[PDB]
Design a protein around this ligand. Structure first.
Ligand SMILES: [Mg+2]
Ligand SMILES: [Mg+2]
Ligand SMILES: [Mg+2]
Ligand SMILES: [Mg+2]
Ligand SMILES: [Mg+2]
Ligand SMILES: [Mg+2]
Ligand SMILES: [Mg+2]
Ligand SMILES: [Mg+2]
Ligand SMILES: [Mg+2]
Ligand SMILES: [Mg+2]
Ligand SMILES: [Mg+2]
Ligand SMILES: [Mg+2]
Ligand SMILES: [Mg+2]
Ligand SMILES: [Mg+2]
Ligand SMILES: [Mg+2]
Ligand SMILES: [Mg+2]
Ligand SMILES: [Mg+2]
Ligand SMILES: [Mg+2]
Ligand SMILES: [Mg+2]
Ligand SMILES: [Mg+2]
Ligand SMILES: [Mg+2]
Ligand SMILES: [Mg+2]
Ligand SMILES: [Mg+2]
Ligand SMILES: [Mg+2]
Ligand SMILES: [Mg+2]
Ligand SMILES: [Mg+2]
Ligand SMILES: [Mg+2]
Ligand SMILES: [Mg+2]
Ligand SMILES: [Mg+2]
Ligand SMILES: [Mg+2]
Ligand SMILES: [Mg+2]
Ligand SMILES: [Mg+2]
Ligand SMILES: [Mg+2]
Ligand SMILES: [Mg+2]
Ligand SMILES: [Mg+2]
Ligand SMILES: [Mg+2]
Ligand SMILES: [Mg+2]
Ligand SMILES: [Mg+2]
Ligand SMILES: [Mg+2]
Ligand SMILES: [Mg+2]
Ligand SMILES: [Mg+2]
Ligand SMILES: [Mg+2]
Ligand SMILES: [Mg+2]
Ligand SMILES: [Mg+2]
Ligand SMILES: [Mg+2]
Ligand SMILES: [Mg+2]
Ligand SMILES: [Mg+2]
Ligand SMILES: [Mg+2]
Ligand SMILES: [Mg+2]
Ligand SMILES: [Mg+2]
Ligand SMILES: [Mg+2]
Ligand SMILES: [Mg+2]
Lengths: 49, 101, 143, 112, 118
RNA sequence: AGGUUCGUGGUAGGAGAGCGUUCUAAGGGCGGUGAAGUCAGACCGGAAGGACUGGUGGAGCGCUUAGAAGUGAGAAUGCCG
RNA sequence: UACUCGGGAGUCAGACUGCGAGUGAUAAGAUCCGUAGUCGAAAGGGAAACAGCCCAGACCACCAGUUAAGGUCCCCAAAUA
RNA sequence: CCGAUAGUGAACCAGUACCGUGAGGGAAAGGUGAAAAGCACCCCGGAAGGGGAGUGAAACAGUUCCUGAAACCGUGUGCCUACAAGUAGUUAGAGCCCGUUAAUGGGUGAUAGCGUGCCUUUUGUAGAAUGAACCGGCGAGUUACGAUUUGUUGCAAGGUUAA
């Protein structure tokens, strides 16, 4: 193949999701975390069990 | 002499030699369009249609097919983090009235 | 598109003289307000003046049905603490009928700059002769 | 051609708001009357504006060969310049800012 | 690699500040108030684009009523007669006839009177 | 690719398709007969956005297909001027 | 439409109105349950103004038409029926 | 990998200036032009600073000097404005002034209808609840190693190497 027309297999690569870049993308202000809990804090959450 | 014709879902008043803008019509530039839905013919003989008059028609010539100026439809709701932007451009057809029958 | 709009000074405004003998106050005022506003012509345009000029005579013989002649009260306040004044419809028909007709009609005109400008076209006399003989005024019969 | 001349005094230690109150008197007037006006106005900006005006007249007469007696003041304005930042010690161990402002003065004379 | 934010912010803010041209005071100079002004103007335009049709229909009805009262008819009676006869002229064109070609308006009113009494 | 029918308000939130920024690789380009930047316009696209013309500027910069991210600000009694 | 399996969540301060009860004084825009609706997350028309009441669910454009609640003397569209 | 708010605190006489009794804390600040050819001489002024003349491709490159945005401060002018109750706009609209990336064009707008900013937190905010003087720059889900699930590719009762 020629290096100026590379095309990887379709469905093998996807675009990363970035949260916190405006409200138009659906992951804006709260970034998929909800409102004011323990799970909404940096490094939050409880143990596995 | 003028007449009242129905086209594009609404009625419009016409005269010979007048240029009008209506909704998009099937027809190329230079063609001839006939409006067969005449509601009222006036001028020295006021004959009205119930609802349409008779085989009397109106003929016109297509001048231009295009789209109008650009709008920008915008909606938002305060404090709810909701916006929506969308542009619009309405197609039309420009005619010149030839004769009234 | 194409809808007719009038221009200032385009429409001819006439002069009318109206006799106010025996007619109820509000029923006369509604007709006069409609005449002044310009709603009786097919050239009506909301944002400009197309109405006529009205002269009212015999204002001292306006009617007041029921017992309004003695307990219909008009109030004013001077914006000083405790400065409210009151006047009955009676003795106001006798002393200053012009004020009675003027404020009754003024309550029916639109409350903006155009309404204030319209109110300047109303002339009311408590007697029978007006001062505007030079205009032409024509007699008008209420509907 | 070249029917007008100008002179500029740049970065003069005078606040613009105090010179734009004297320079509004001489706009659109004869040069003799303007000099007389600046002579009898007891403000602090009068000598500076007068010096600039006389310089403008002098280089209008010398470089461009016009007549002194036939001149008027077309334009006159004051523009801002760099400010020097100083401090003034207030009470209880804190200081407040002081702005020593400068200005640019321009006057243009021409034939009537 | 570092991506420093140049040339992209100003380009976007200047568009809004240009869209807010003609407003009073700082509403045509400063980005923060110009953005609010532009959003509010868009919302107002969206709503008035619906109220415009209502306003014009009211105006046409008022003019038709005024013209019909001169023929000893109400607006209600005239419209009922026109609907009963079988005439489908909208309010816009009736108002046009009333304003100018009043002869044709009177002919239509005669038709309505004929159908109404009948 | 063309049809028929039913739909198209929306917060937390789930899914999809995209615009733009910096760098790299290949192909193909323009530029002292004036690049990037900046200023002004009544142009184009469904949105993010993209052109064309002219003024200033005086030496670098696009386009197509992929790849990698210090990746897009109006708010934090935010830090600096 | 259901159901089973698997990936990702948010929510666990609710409010008023109609009906059925408790506490209260057969008080509260009170408090606590059952049942239906609306708001939350719903713009538009009527209640003067008005989250929760009455009518009714906004894909975009039109200077087109018919209706719902509510209305037709003037402000104010339509009956001085 | 960065490109002067970045990259070392420090691209420049930087652990300096400054602060503290002391240990200690700790900045700001890059660019004329290819070449100084860095403006002889004349005029106003005490000077600073200007206007000519000259050098230069350019002085609107003149010893914080490439480019020169916004806030902010001014000068001139086309339209409107001193009886009018204004989240400042939007829709209808006369008059006056212009003439474009030429198309049902541009600027200002007397008058009329409608209309209580943005964000956060809330059952509910125009809110007399919180935040922001304005403009500009900087400023927040990332990487390493494991687990699990979906997609793609190679081989397939086999697959695959680590150091
Ligand atoms: Mg994506
Ligand atoms: Mg969401
Ligand atoms: Mg936000
Ligand atoms: Mg929060
Ligand atoms: Mg939570
Ligand atoms: Mg102290
Ligand atoms: Mg002290
Ligand atoms: Mg870089
Ligand atoms: Mg930024
Ligand atoms: Mg304006
Ligand atoms: Mg939707
Ligand atoms: Mg819908
Ligand atoms: Mg998602
Ligand atoms: Mg060339
Ligand atoms: Mg050449
Ligand atoms: Mg670059
Ligand atoms: Mg350029
Ligand atoms: Mg591009
Ligand atoms: Mg960033
Ligand atoms: Mg800021
Ligand atoms: Mg500050
Ligand atoms: Mg599940
Ligand atoms: Mg629980
Ligand atoms: Mg609970
Ligand atoms: Mg409950
Ligand atoms: Mg109760
Ligand atoms: Mg309660
Ligand atoms: Mg909620
Ligand atoms: Mg509602
Ligand atoms: Mg409502
Ligand atoms: Mg009420
Ligand atoms: Mg709300
Ligand atoms: Mg009416
Ligand atoms: Mg720099
Ligand atoms: Mg540094
Ligand atoms: Mg010391
Ligand atoms: Mg150098
Ligand atoms: Mg010197
Ligand atoms: Mg010199
Ligand atoms: Mg020179
Ligand atoms: Mg030369
Ligand atoms: Mg250079
Ligand atoms: Mg410079
Ligand atoms: Mg500037
Ligand atoms: Mg007055
Ligand atoms: Mg006035
Ligand atoms: Mg208004
Ligand atoms: Mg509370
Ligand atoms: Mg307040
Ligand atoms: Mg708080
Ligand atoms: Mg505050
Ligand atoms: Mg496999």
């Amino acid at each position: 193949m020629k290096l100026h027309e590379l095309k990887p297999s379709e469905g093998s690569r996807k675009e990363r999701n970035r949260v916190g870049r405006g409200t138009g993308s659906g992951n804006g202000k709260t970034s998929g975390r909800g409102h004011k809990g323990q799970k909404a804090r940096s490094g939050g959450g409880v143990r596995l069990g | 002499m003028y007449a009242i014709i129905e086209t594009g879902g609404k009625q419009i008043k016409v005269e010979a030699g007048q240029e009008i803008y209506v909704e998009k019509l099937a027809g190329e530039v230079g063609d001839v369009v006939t409006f067969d839905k005449v509601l009222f013919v006036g001028g020295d003989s006021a004959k009205v249609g119930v609802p349409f008059v008779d085989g009397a028609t109106v003929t016109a010539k297509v001048e231009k097919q295009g789209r109008a100026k650009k709008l920008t439809v915008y909606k938002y709701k305060p404090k709810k983090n909701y916006h929506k932007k969308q542009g619009h451009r309405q197609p039309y057809t420009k005619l010149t009235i030839d004769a009234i029958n | 598109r194409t809808t007719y709009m009038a221009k200032p000074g385009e429409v001819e405004r006439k002069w009318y003289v109206i006799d106010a003998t025996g007619v109820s106050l509000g029923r006369l005022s509604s007709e006069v307000a409609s005449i002044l506003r310009g709603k009786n012509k097919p050239q009506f345009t909301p944002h400009i003046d197309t109405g006529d000029f009205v002269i009212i005579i015999n204002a001292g013989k306006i009617g007041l049905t029921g017992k309004k002649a003695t307990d219909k009260i008009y109030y004013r306040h001077s914006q000083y603490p405790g400065g409210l004044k009151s006047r009955t419809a009676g003795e106001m028909r006798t002393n200053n009928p012009e004020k009675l007709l003027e404020l009754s009609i003024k309550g029916m005109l639109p409350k903006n700059s155009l309404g204030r400008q319209l109110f300047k076209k109303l002339h009311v006399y408590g007697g029978s002769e007006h001062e505007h003989a030079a205009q032409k005024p024509e007699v008008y019969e209420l509907r | 051609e070249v029917t007008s001349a100008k002179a500029v005094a740049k970065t003069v230690r005078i606040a613009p708001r105090k010179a734009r109150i004297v320079i509004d008197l001489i706009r659109g007037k004869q040069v003799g009357e303007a000099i007389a006006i600046l002579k009898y106005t007891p403000r602090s900006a009068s000598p500076i504006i007068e010096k600039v005006l006389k310089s403008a007249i002098a280089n209008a007469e010398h470089n461009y060969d016009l007549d002194i007696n036939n001149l008027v003041v077309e334009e006159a304005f004051v523009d801002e310049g760099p400010t020097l930042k100083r401090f003034r010690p207030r009470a209880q161990g804190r200081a407040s800012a002081i702005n020593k402002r400068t200005s640019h003065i321009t006057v243009v004379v021409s034939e009537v | 690699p570092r991506v420093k934010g140049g040339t992209v912010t100003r380009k976007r803010r200047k568009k809004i500040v240009k869209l807010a041209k003609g407003y009073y005071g700082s509403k045509h100079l400063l980005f923060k108030v110009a953005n609010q002004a532009v959003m509010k103007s868009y919302q107002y335009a969206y709503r008035d684009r619906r109220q415009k049709k209502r306003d014009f229909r009211r105006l046409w009805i008022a003019r038709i009523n005024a013209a019909a009262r001169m023929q000893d008819l109400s607006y209600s009676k005239l419209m009922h007669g026109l609907k009963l006869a079988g005439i489908d002229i909208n309010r816009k064109m009736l108002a046009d006839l009333a304003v100018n070609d009043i002869a044709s308006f009177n002919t239509l009113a005669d038709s309505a009177k004929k159908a109404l009494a009948k």
